């Protein structure tokens, strides 16, 4: 069952970011604070949506996506990526890391039905990376 | 208005584009014609410095992030 | 049966070469448009008189002379010329191209009687020849500078038109017109083309290059 | 039989390029009226030879280049282009395209036995799109 | 004092290129710490020309030797 | 057994570099001269350390880095390379062929003991080839006059140099050479090569009729 | 008039021998007495700089076509 | 077997070109001195290619061709010449003098295999000449 | 005294060329020295207008007489 | 035997072209009459020696040597020359026109003994025609 996380924490989140900035210490560490439980595609981009202004925000979607492009192919360069499975139905398409695939778009319950929980630390794991590089890039 | 933004003098880029990026979303355009629109605003507008340094692109930037992210590496810092 | 040319085309031709002048593409246009079907000496030189003032043409028959001269040496070089015959009865004598042979001087009918298609071929390509020449002798690349106002459309209309119009080889024009678009060219073009990822290796994709990248102003 | 256009057209072609510019409407409509009939590699590098500017003339070689490149790999891509055949042997190069093959080069008559219907209004099509590049280029 | 030099407005690459590995290899850095600072040391001074130049590099350059010659090769002949 | 080379030769070498430079044909040939026995890889590079700056030597590096790496792919697409054996075990890798190998870091004795005569020759052509990219990336013929007060074999000179050291084909710089003589070198001796009664067809023989007929001034 | 004709200060070379050419051929000399008339007005009208770049001829010019030739070539560009 | 000149030598020689000029009689000394030996075409192309400048080369090339064309005429006038040989199969072509000549052009081990002793003397005077007359002419 | 002979400004080549001569042939020099030293007065003495049109004589002239011709055809009406 | 001029006459010749000038009709007419009976090299020689001045004596005597050489010429391209004979050792060489051959160098006695009159008509035509040379060039 999917639960939001608390408008008050994100809102408090958001002005962590206006005042401080994208790349402060404890703007970090209070997105690892809010990244802690594994998060589904609905969640993270919703969140960086709201933190992040447009322009970041479009660059926080690029970064984004070629990290979860890395992993992907390092997914495909094992077959024991806790995403993936041990047949070959199982292997993880990129559509279903961005919530793009079928019976997951728009839907944050659906999305947390068919998400596997290797799926979700690795999508968690690459919005970090990609936040950093986007903070790294800003200023 | 979106055809009225311009980049202020000392106005610095991230700030023009998110401005330029809110008013242009926020508008009646189509959703097919908002990213030329964006780009195409990036090149006349933000000032002749920005102007020339996008101009002079030994690649061709087709999207408002690879626009945003060139002119953030090769920007003067001032 | 001899055919005259319209005296219409000829005196078109004619301000043609009066307004354009004798180098003007448009010009060696209507030249080889007028030259397209074998013409007899007398319809050459009849031509040439009309269309071209006095000077250049006395430099015309100099030329033409030259070439078929050069023309006649390559015959007696090969036995099997469009012109020649199998024996030596049918050598073709510098009179008989020049329409001054037996039966020929003076009557266009005659001649066309005796001439040979190929005699007529290459007293046309000869007189076309001798056309260029004149043209390039009648009317300096390195000293070519793009002017500060200048716009660099014109600028490489104006080299290009120089280097090509000039007296180097035909393999010799497209890095002589390259490297002087990287010397010349003011500094901001100049540095325009150093910083180009890619390697311009052609006057054509240099311009591309350049009017793509350039400063509007 | 090769036939050519008249230097009367041809002329007044190049003093309206002269006036009016490579862009303007009426320019267009008389190109594209010079440009009825499928024309020979010959006729077209002549035309634009004697309409063109030396710069202009350079980029319009480019750009025609690049056109014909894109018709040979859309024919190497289908074997039924009106200009290709049903065997090997009629597969058409850009030799023969841009009138570089045996028994073309400096000859229009050679050049109008041995050329197909498709391959000139292959030809003909390509040199109008890329003098529509040239001219959305030039100014 | 290597963080103090700076490429003249007249002066060459090449000049301040030996100028400065000459005062970064006889300073008292560690020997792992030399290229990393002359790299950056390229990047930020050497005038903004050449700053542009090397900034919108579509390769990576990792080495001093490297950074020289590409800047070499793109320079603005004057 | 490894021998060093004389300081000497070595010292003046860097005088000839720091004097001449890195492209004159003397240096060029000086390093030809200290580069003809198999050098092992601690030579080469304290050579190229004492005789270049800084960044020359930054620059050197890279360039020989990637002529050696050009070097093992062609060993590797030839098993026959006098560097390479002719079983898998004696393939040469580039920490054999810069002297970082096992056995041979810093010391040129065992260098040489481990070294083939392949290998040196290798690794000495290599550094050569990249010598001479860096030389010529180190250091515009189009803008180039005759000035006022300058003789013409001192102008002669100049112009053949950044002819000859440009980025022509080695088939068209004498056309270039010959129609720059013409349009620079100031109008009196532009006058002396136009009125020239024979037609000149090589730079020396241009230069040779107008050092008789030049004004003794 | 032929032998009143000048070539003069401001006038081109080609010009002068058309105007000579014409007045020479259109008068009530004989045909045969034509070219040397045209040569040795070359020689004595044409003014001075031109009557000594045809005086140092290397080699004889026996034609008012090759005259024309010459002195083309080995004008003074101006 | 070839031997090259020590560098050393010509960058002395190449010097004393340098400051004291052509025409001194201690450089016509020195370039005696270094002319000792019967030199061949690769050895008296390269020394003159380092210690003339570009419009002295190219005025020495000219002056060596017109000396060795002399030569080759005084070779015809004579069967006796120490450069040919007895038979008509050993005249020598301006080829083989300029080193020109097949299994020669830019291999000096090959030069020195097929070269004559006559050849080579023949070749180092004309050379003398031609620097004399150069240096005379130079300044 | 002959090595003091010079062109005047005004004065003609005719009478420089009769008085060098006179000069020349009346002295000391031996009888085998005196062409020589005539062509080479006239080279390095008759004011640089006629020392250039000697310099730039595409045939070799080798006697005084040839020299006397060639300025005569050539010299500058005046 | 020979027999000199008078120095009255050649007095008064000198006089002649030295108000009259070279050019005038009663200078070539007194010319013409002190060269009417043909006249030995050494007569001609010294008689312009003495009427012309120094640089119109230089004149006179390279274009004496350019009609010598083409009466050479000439004589050369016919056996039957009043100068030459029938055998080819009776041919006219230059150094036996110019007075320079053996036996005549300086001596006028043994000059008119070796000379034939055809000799001496021919030298004197030549004479007379480069007079008419430099005189056509000196005014």
Known sequence: ???????????????????????????????????????????????????????????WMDAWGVQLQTVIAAATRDP?????????????????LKGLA????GNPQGQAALLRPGELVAITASALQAFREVARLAE
Chains 1, 4, 8, 10 share one sequence.
């Open 80 to 96: 024991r990526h806790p995403a993936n499975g041990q047949g070959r139905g199982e292997r993880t398409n990129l559509n279903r």
């Open 1 to 59: 069952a999917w639960t939001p996380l608390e408008p008050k924490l994100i809102t408090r989140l958001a002005d962590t970011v206006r005042t401080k900035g994208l790349r402060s210490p404890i703007t970090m560490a209070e997105v690892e604070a809010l990244m802690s439980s594994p998060l589904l595609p609905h969640d993270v981009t919703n969140l960086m949506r709201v933190i992040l202004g447009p322009a970041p925000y479009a660059l």
């Open 102 to 105: 079928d019976g997951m778009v």
